[PDB]
Design a protein around this ligand. Structure first.
Ligand SMILES: [K+]
Ligand SMILES: [K+]
Ligand SMILES: [K+]
Ligand SMILES: [K+]
Ligand SMILES: [Mg+2]
Lengths: 409, 204
């Protein structure tokens, strides 16, 4: 517990940019794009106000649009007088992927018609399209093969406080070890993580901070409408924060919370507000109406595990169940606890052979061991129970491909 | 029940079945079969013939049967076993786990085939487990797959009975003969014997 991420003060004008959303849509061969930026303000509207959105490729301005406030009519009462949407044509855009993380810079200026800046906000923009078509997850029209890992935010001295050096260490080691993707198990991460993933190139599953695993049954809260409001803010406030990062390619509704009607409501809410990214969620059997991707945890390659209600089929068999058409990407597989990863090659051979097996996220990146000191002041790696915590789950906190200090297993 | 249409030795295999010249002759092979046999409850599927590539004549006759008799699926394996002229993915000699990625007409692993992007049909092999001589090695691998995968709905072994013929030696004693034993040439020798049973119905 505690105040474990940054604290800041931000001084904005009273007439201010209060939100902006950046979308990029493409023609059939990605030779042309439109960047559409919706910009919202708070404060006092004045007829001399304007917004300009400009797009930069390094030091060169490649596109720009300027308009006064006042959006299109949307219903019988008019439109948003406090919004405007800029549309920028971009010819032959450099496309973003984990392979080549090409980025542009978008600068959003709130200014006056005669040239005075009120304030500016900005983001890195990666031109890429994510869509599911004919059962395949496509990035810029090509089917992804996710070499993923789940990564919790953990440091053996600082607990759950993340810092730039440790983030960078982790991304370098991930890419050096042929990972291209990370799942934010199981919550939104420190804001710097997405900047780093945008710039170094990793595909990100951004996951709402909702896990109710110890309820019986697992969906007791997520099926209860009285919990829809609290759940809703965990999803909606994540999308409002992170929706402009190109590295985020998939939203997840949380983890191990069964499947309840609140899931279906929030699945639909994201699909409404952001059609640019698939939504996944594994709870309730991994192939429910709240997920665009079959996303099981620890389904095996050839062996079925036919549990009541929530079976984990062989991933090869799952793809072809009667009526099923979705891609399958394991949200967790290959549990790397202690001396493990036996069988890892069997997954990769299947992922290469079956178009719709589009990979998975290993569980997990780093052991959650914590440093304690003995009588002599010498450090040692501690696990569950070592702090007098009880009940505890002992060494199950260490499931990493690397030790807590980032040494490889 | 399968129409008497096979043009395997054409090059390419569909040279006649894509030729509207040959649409009349093929049409009567299909239509006169359905007119004869459509009251039999044992017929559950119609087939448009065998090893004749995939031609437009197949698509015309597929839809003729779908129109006249909605009570039975139509299948046909030619042209890669999963064309627009078949309601059932019906490959011949597709293997259980191993792909054979032939150009144009690949034989995928049957487990892979079911889940190719956009595919939803059942798969029943029109021919599998070629029982020539000392064979049926790997038979159990098919059955384990058929039982594990709902949409792998089985197959037809190739085939029931050896096509050996009886000849008589200089003493009048009978012996089983195969391709070329009648002075027939060119011939394909013992390939005519692929059965689970010998020609006299003794089991292999
Ligand atoms: K694949
Ligand atoms: K664990
Ligand atoms: K079956
Ligand atoms: K033969
Ligand atoms: Mg300017």
């Amino acid at each position: 517990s505690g105040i474990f991420r940054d604290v800041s003060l931000l001084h904005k004008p009273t007439t201010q940019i209060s939100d902006f959303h950046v979308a990029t849509r493409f023609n059939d061969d990605f030779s042309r794009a439109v960047l559409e930026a919706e910009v919202q303000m708070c404060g006092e509207l004045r007829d001399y106000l304007r917004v300009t959105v400009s797009l930069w490729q390094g030091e060169t301005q490649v596109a720009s649009g300027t308009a006064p406030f006042g959006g299109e009519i949307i219903d019988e009462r008019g439109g948003y007088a406090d919004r405007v949407t800029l549309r920028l044509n971009v010819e032959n855009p450099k496309l973003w992927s984990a392979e080549i993380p090409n980025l542009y810079r978008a600068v959003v200026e709130l200014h006056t018609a005669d040239g005075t800046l009120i304030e500016a906000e900005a983001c890195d923009v990666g031109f890429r399209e994510v869509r599911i078509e004919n059962g395949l997850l496509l990035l810029n029209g090509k089917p992804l093969l996710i070499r993923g890992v789940n990564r919790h935010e953990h440091h053996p001295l600082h607990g759950q406080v993340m810092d730039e050096q440790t983030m960078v260490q982790d991304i370098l080691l991930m890419k050096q070890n042929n990972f291209n993707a990370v799942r934010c198990s199981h919550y939104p991460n420190h804001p710097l993580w997405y900047t780093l993933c945008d710039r170094y190139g990793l595909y990100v599953v951004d996951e709402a901070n909702i896990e109710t695993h110890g309820m019986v049954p697992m969906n007791r809260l997520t099926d209860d409408p009285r919990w829809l409001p609290a759940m809703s803010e965990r999803v909606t406030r994540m999308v409002q924060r992170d929706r402009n990062h190109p590295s985020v390619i998939i939203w997840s509704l949380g983890n191990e919370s069964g499947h309840g009607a609140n899931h279906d409501a929030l699945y639909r809410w994201i699909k409404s507000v952001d059609p640019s990214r698939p939504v996944q969620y594994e709870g309730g059997g991994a192939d429910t109406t709240a997920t665009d991707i079959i996303c099981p945890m620890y389904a095996r390659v050839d062996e079925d595990q036919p549990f009541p209600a929530v079976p984990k089929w062989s991933i090869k068999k799952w793809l072809s169940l009667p009526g099923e058409t979705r891609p399958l990407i394991l949200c967790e597989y290959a549990h790397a606890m202690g001396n493990s990863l036996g069988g890892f090659a069997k997954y990769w051979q299947a992922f290469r052979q079956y178009p719709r097996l589009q990979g998975g996220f290993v569980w997990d990146w780093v052991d959650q061991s914590l440093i304690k000191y003995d009588e002599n002041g010498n450090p040692w790696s501690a696990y569950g129970g070592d702090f007098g915590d009880t009940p505890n789950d002992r060494q199950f906190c260490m499931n990493g491909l690397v030790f807590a200090d980032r040494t490889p297993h």
